[PDB]
Design a protein around this ligand. Structure first.
Ligand SMILES: CC(C)C[C@H](Cl)C(=O)O
Ligand SMILES: CC(C)C[C@H](Cl)C(=O)O
Lengths: 302, 302
């Protein structure tokens, strides 16, 4: 009992494993319908783009997914549900590179793009539906796990500070490897906050935002990489949403680039679409000559 | 030679005072036309609002202004221009309370307001035109002054830090008088920047923004007024615009109030309309539970 947009994540308990069958049967009815919607998206692409060999390949993954899914017989016991999980697992892996295949197929296809609002809409709808589908699927699998402080993929006691720190260490390493240093990150605000929340969207978004804030900081301090401005992260936790402000002193996004930056890495426009999909937002405040403030808002689970 | 939107401020030099006659004759043709546009605005008000005695009074100031202006004969020498200045001076003073009279007339008139986009449009158009008219008029008068680092109302060497500091001292005093203390203000970024710029819009806007940031800070620290979070102002100066970010730790503007706050003190919605009128913007980022960031952008003079 809990939801993403129009999709339900099951918070349940059954010592017989009754909840696993109910969740399995839900996932089994919901997946094919949503995969078919993805097939329609490909069908309605401008012909010339839909013809691109990589776009066509991704199109074919979805048909294949829909075939295997609809071919699976209904679930009438635990044993069915178990094998169904195996299928779902295989599909999640087969589809792991999809975002990357799309970004490539569409680049090969840049010249033939006449209407950009049309393709941008396709990407947003595809990528965000894909996310929802993957959360729902991953949730069901994670219900088989016995891990504490987790109901499926819902973490019952999530520390925004903690999950930010993990992605900071990650982004710092990439940055140190490329520039030989990385900005110290400071975290302020509600650093002690804990509340139920689904990690996954944060796991996509944060590393992107952290990579940008760090890149921009280094690219504008080439002369002094051993000494660069800190990246300052602020956490604001209230009853409606969680806000994570990420501020860098990297010189800002230039006026001429302001529009190009939020459109299709490819990490920012995806991140914004994810945030809105979940009922939040991703906004940018550029101080040209100084730095950039990025505001990630995500609604509280309920 | 220099401009606000569709209006020209004259940067000129004449030892005979030839520039004063050219500016005077420009101001004399431009004022009546723009006052008449203000009269149309009142004429097109919903009857029931336009009937309010205070709204009617302001309406009558404008007609009166337009009469005295059109009655003034053309300017053919320095002596005419001098008396014209006297008239313009008198009008600027007669009209000094207009914003306040409007805000009052419309409050008396709240119940009868059916379409809010209509009135909001009237206010924006009136208040922002009024500003432009007052800049143009004040500029002409200031051309009579011999003050250094000033061509009329254009300051040739304006320090954003300096003008911010003046409004900080001002807002601090009001705040100390009401709460018995006030937040320390810190200024960072391009604190050494200097460039031609027209002070006036900053003189309206900054004190409003500073009053809010300080009020919000005190209202959320009632227990400890002797010790409150600093207000942090950041100046970003580039070739396109000037950005002044004003950040407070006053708990943010609550979700439920987010829309009500930018609509018609009355200081924020005016400030935003002024900023856009001049080709800039005024945007708010609320971190509910923590504070608010306000971003004032104003285009560089050119
Ligand atoms: C069959 C599903 C799980 C595939 C999802 Cl929609 C994805 O593209 O990864
Ligand atoms: C006649 C002019 C100078 C009046 C201006 Cl538009 C104002 O209302 O103050």
């Amino acid at each position: 009992v809990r939801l993403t947009p129009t999709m339900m994540l099951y918070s349940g308990r059954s010592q017989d494993g009754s909840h696993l069958l109910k969740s399995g049967r839900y996932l089994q009815q919901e997946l094919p319908v949503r995969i078919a919607h993805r097939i329609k998206g490909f069908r309605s692409l401008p012909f010339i783009i839909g013809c691109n060999p990589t776009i066509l390949h991704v199109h074919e993954l979805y048909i294949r997914a829909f075939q295997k899914l609809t071919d699976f017989p209904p679930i009438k016991d635990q044993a069915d549900e178990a094998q169904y999980c195996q299928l779902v697992r295989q599909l999640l892996d087969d589809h792991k590179d999809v975002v990357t295949l799309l970004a490539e197929g569409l680049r090969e296809s840049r010249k033939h793009i006449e209407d950009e609002k049309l393709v941008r809409y396709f990407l947003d709808k595809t990528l965000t539906s894909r996310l929802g589908i993957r959360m729902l699927a991953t949730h069901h699998l994670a219900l088989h796990e016995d891990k504490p402080d987790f109901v499926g993929i819902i973490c019952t006691r999530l520390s925004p500070k903690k999950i930010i720190e993990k992605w900071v260490d990650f982004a710092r390493r990439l940055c140190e490897h490329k520039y030989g240093n990385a900005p110290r990150v400071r975290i302020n605000g509600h650093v002690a906050a804990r509340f139920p929340f689904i990690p996954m969207p944060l796991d996509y978004i944060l590393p992107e935002l952290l990579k940008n804030a760090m890149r921009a900081t280094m690219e504008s301090h080439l002369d002094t990489p051993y000494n660069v401005p800190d990246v300052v992260i602020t956490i604001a936790n209230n009853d409606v949403d969680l806000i994570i402000r990420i501020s860098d002193r990297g010189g800002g996004i230039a006026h001429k680039d302001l529009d190009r930056v939020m459109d299709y890495g490819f990490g920012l426009p995806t991140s914004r679409a994810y945030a809105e999909y979940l009922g939040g937002s991703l906004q940018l405040q550029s101080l040209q000559g100084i730095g950039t403030d990025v505001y990630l808002r995500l609604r509280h689970i309920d």
